[PDB]
Amino acid sequence: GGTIARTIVLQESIGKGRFGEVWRGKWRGEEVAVKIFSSREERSWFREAEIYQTVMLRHENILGFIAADNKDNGTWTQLWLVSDYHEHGSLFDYLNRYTVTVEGMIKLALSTASGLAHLHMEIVGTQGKPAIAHRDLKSKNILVKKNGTCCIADLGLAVRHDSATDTIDIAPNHRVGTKRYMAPEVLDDSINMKHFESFKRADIYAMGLVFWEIARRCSIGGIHEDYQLPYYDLVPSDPSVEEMRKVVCEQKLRPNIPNRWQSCEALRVMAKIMRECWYANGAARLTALRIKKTLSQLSQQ
Numbered sequence: 001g002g003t004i005a006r007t008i009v010l011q012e013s014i015g016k017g018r019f020g021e022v023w024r025g026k027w028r029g030e031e032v033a034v035k036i037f038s039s040r041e042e043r044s045w046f047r048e049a050e051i052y053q054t055v056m057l058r059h060e061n062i063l064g065f066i067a068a069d070n071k072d073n074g075t076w077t078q079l080w081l082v083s084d085y086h087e088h089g090s091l092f093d094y095l096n097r098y099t100v101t102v103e104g105m106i107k108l109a110l111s112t113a114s115g116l117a118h119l120h121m122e123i124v125g126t127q128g129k130p131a132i133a134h135r136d137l138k139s140k141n142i143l144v145k146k147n148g149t150c151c152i153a154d155l156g157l158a159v160r161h162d163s164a165t166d167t168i169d170i171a172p173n174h175r176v177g178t179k180r181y182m183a184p185e186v187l188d189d190s191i192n193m194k195h196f197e198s199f200k201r202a203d204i205y206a207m208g209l210v211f212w213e214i215a216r217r218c219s220i221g222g223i224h225e226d227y228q229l230p231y232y233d234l235v236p237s238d239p240s241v242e243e244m245r246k247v248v249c250e251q252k253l254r255p256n257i258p259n260r261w262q263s264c265e266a267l268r269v270m271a272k273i274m275r276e277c278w279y280a281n282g283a284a285r286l287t288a289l290r291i292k293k294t295l296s297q298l299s300q301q
């Protein structure tokens with residue numbers, strides 16, 4: 001019989017995401033992470049399996065996919081996605097728990113940017129990889145590895161591009177992701193969803209917000225900010241699209257960039273990146289590749 005889900009033993013509930021539930025399990029004694037969906041969540045499970053099985057997707061900054069599988073407990077069927085397990089868990093949890101050095105902040109930012117640039121990059125060839133946009137990037141969907149680098153997870157809302165015929169592989173709906181991190185053009189439904197570049201540009205805005213979350217926790221001489229989500233100072237917990245739109249589109253506010261960040265070159269570079277991710281017009285935003293190059297150069301300095 002089956003060689004994956006059949007031989008994995010669940011040990012601990014991690015939490016619920018948008019769809020399904022995440023567990024820590026053991027496969028041949030090795031820790032793995034398992035996202036479990038019910039029968040009525042088959043479409044979400046299949047789509048996420050489909051994205052993870054994209055040719056040439058594997059990358060140190062994308063969550064390591066092990067397998068999609070079914071498991072029948074004798075009463076109902078569970079739909080499984082099995083991945084690498086990372087003890088730290090999400091970047092959200094990590095940044096709540098800890099402060100980071102300049103070096104640590106750069107490692108988190110660069111690795112996140114490298115993951116995104118890999119998603120975004122079309123790789124030509126017989127085993128070519130289509131460009132992929134995530135559509136729900138946030139600190140809760142990025143995991144921190146033991147080596148202090150990040151990998152991106154939760155690929156179920158992603159869209160894939162066919163460059164040749166110029167088509168996206170699904171018919172995407174407006175506003176599928178996390179409201180707090182929606183780009184201005186997503187918030188007001190102005191985004192042109194026939195244009196794949198628009199989804200890439202929306203991801204960059206969200207990454208900018210994640211970079212802000214990280215930079216806050218960069219402690220220099222004991223001085224740092226408390227952990228906050230972007231827009232903590234302007235919208236309620238669990239904000240509505242209208243609440244978000246009023247702040248982001250009408251008032252045109254972005255997360256505050258503290259004065260203390262100009263006094264350190266690494267923070268200065270990060271703050272400049274954030275601004276250039278946060279333009280209301282997506283076409284003006286930096287690319288993931290450019291951001292990766294800037295952070296790579298910085299980590300060398």
Ligand SMILES: O=C(Nc1cc(Nc2c(Cl)cnc3c2OCO3)ccn1)C1CC1
Binds near residue numbers: 088
């Ligand atoms: O939570 C922890 N680790 C952890 C959590 C993961 N979450 C996810 C996410 Cl976010 C999305 N898709 C998944 C996941 O697992 C399978 O598919 C993955 C790996 N490791 C440690 C704090 C206990």
